[PDB]
Amino acid sequence: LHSEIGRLNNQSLLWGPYRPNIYFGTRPRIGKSLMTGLMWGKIESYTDFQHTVRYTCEQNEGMKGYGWDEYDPRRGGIQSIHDIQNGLDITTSFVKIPGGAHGGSWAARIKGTLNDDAPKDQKTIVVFYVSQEGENSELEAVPSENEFGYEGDVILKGRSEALGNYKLVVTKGKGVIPQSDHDLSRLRGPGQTVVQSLTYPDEVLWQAKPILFQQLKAGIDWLVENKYDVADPPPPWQVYLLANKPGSGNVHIVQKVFEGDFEFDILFSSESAGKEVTSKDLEREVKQATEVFGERFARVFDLKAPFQGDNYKKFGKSMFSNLIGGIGYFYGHSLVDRSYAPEYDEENEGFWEDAAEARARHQEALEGPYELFTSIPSRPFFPRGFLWDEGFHLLPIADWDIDLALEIIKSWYNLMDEDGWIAREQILGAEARSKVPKEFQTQYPHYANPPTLFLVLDNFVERLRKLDETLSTASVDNPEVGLEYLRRLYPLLRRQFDWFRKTQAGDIKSYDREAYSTKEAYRWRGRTVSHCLTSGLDDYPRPQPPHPGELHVDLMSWVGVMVKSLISIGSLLGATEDVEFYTKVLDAIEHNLDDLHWSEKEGCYCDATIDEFEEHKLVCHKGYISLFPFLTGLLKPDSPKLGKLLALIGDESELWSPYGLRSLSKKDEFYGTAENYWRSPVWININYLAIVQLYNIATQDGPYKETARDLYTRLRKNIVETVYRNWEETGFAWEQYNPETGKGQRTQHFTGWTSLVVKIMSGHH
């Protein structure tokens, strides 16, 4: 029954529009297979299309916004794109039709409406680009009856081992199609849908834009060769229409030109399913999908006061759909330094200069291939897996579809190397690499990242202890299934736990350091003079200068987070030998957090270093770091220390802004200095952990219950309103929010842990 559910999940999740890096396109969860992609662009001139054409996601003054209004990766969804440059409002509805043996069928409708400012007669080039990778597969465009192109639908017939037999149909569409009176129409037709079938070596099929332009350029060359010139040039839109040449190959360009508003359909028909998929099928399944999305959202995301209002419902639907709608499939080689240089042991004073030298050897090489199914922080800037980010992405996703979240976790843990390492940023394949400068691609097997995925596993474990609808919850509804998953994952959790202790160990015994345990002390490998990237909190102030004597209170608390989980999971598997180890380590951490990190002078937690005179110094920077034992749920509810932290969280003059908790205190000397990334702004993910821990303390008998209740009430309000106001004004989820003005700053389309807001509103943790 475990194997059974697994196969049903595979079959359910196989197809999706899993290319979040481009505005719209589809690929299955298969590394070398069939992919599609949409491109569009107004044409007003002879040179303009090259600049107007749209394909990969960006965010500039040209684009008002875009994103999913509804989405379930099982069923499909509706995406809206608001394009100022090209005067278009576009809809992309995508839908999956289960059936057959090969992961079902699917259909998409592309509708573009010219906006109010666009010329009523605008000419817009639309391209649907289709590639297929694999040695033993075939794909052919059925030629048309007409001489120059297609009056009607374009039919591609294809086959591969993976997908069996299929047909992909690009319908004729609605829309005026412009007609050219020029001489050239005697050779290229007056204007019709056209198809080019090409072959390129498999590894470059992803480069749709250059591949396209190569053809456009070859057509224009041919005009110039065949005496077409400026004495009498054809219209631009016809200069940019490809000579029809359908056939077979691993690339198929389908091109339409519309005047005015337009719409057309894509129908992908798995041959091993029922009958082929029709446009009426599309329409039905789209409507059905909304009803289902609707009914689920009300149950799963029941917004409590004061957010029960319809405005907040729209907002939640947007933040949710954008988060889950970023789910992508990625495949290929990564760039890793497998040298394991001594300098990366960071044992020296000045270890950052050593480590710079080791990198300067450039021993990194491509390895893999690897595959990851995962949600992402940022369609337009970083459409890729980020390790601790996924901890946050999956909390709302798990609520929606726990089996979907377990899939993603499984996908992440399958990356883990023999040592227990997962690179914190997954750049898989040449396509993924195109977005990242060569200088930042290399991962380092000594670089950790908060193990936030345990937080999801935590929630699954509590859910466990206490057909699309069915599948979504099958791993909790069927206890044996739940358990077997954990049985299989457990070895890797532990491996990672062990890897943290192996690679990210602090030095107690080599200095004048007394503490209840000689084991427990941690220090993030990777830190440079001004940064500690690995911790998540790029430029939060740390001991200066960095030093092998450092111990970081956040890291220790993450280890705490892991042990607590290992205990929970271990006990469910009865690994008794193990659970006793875990308890002896939990105990030590709790003590050692105090002995090593607590400050009585300052009334919060601190990082440590060791002095110019070689003794342990606390280094206090009041902020997120300072609250860490609390954020990660490690303090007892009656603890004096908790109370003192509640004072610090509460205190406007330190961390409490009208807009949420400040990353760093206004009284810290580093407030709003340098890049000011984590040095004042409000970050939703850390605010989320604060909110969840406050509510825990609020709903339990104890001393701080009623202060906690106040702070919860108010924080949740402040965080939700801030993210909401900004969404209302700008259309965007933002990466962080400004403590003074409440304005969203840095990156837009951050969905991204900003979406945690849907869970904040819905409460009952």
Ligand SMILES: COCCc1ccc(CCCCCN2C[C@H](O)[C@@H](O)[C@H](O)[C@H]2CO)cc1
């Ligand atoms: C115009 O726009 C500027 C574009 C631009 C694009 C990508 C980049 C590199 C990658 C950015 C990492 C972001 N972020 C950092 C957070 O601190 C960290 O906690 C988190 O894990 C990670 C992701 O969520 C830099 C700049």
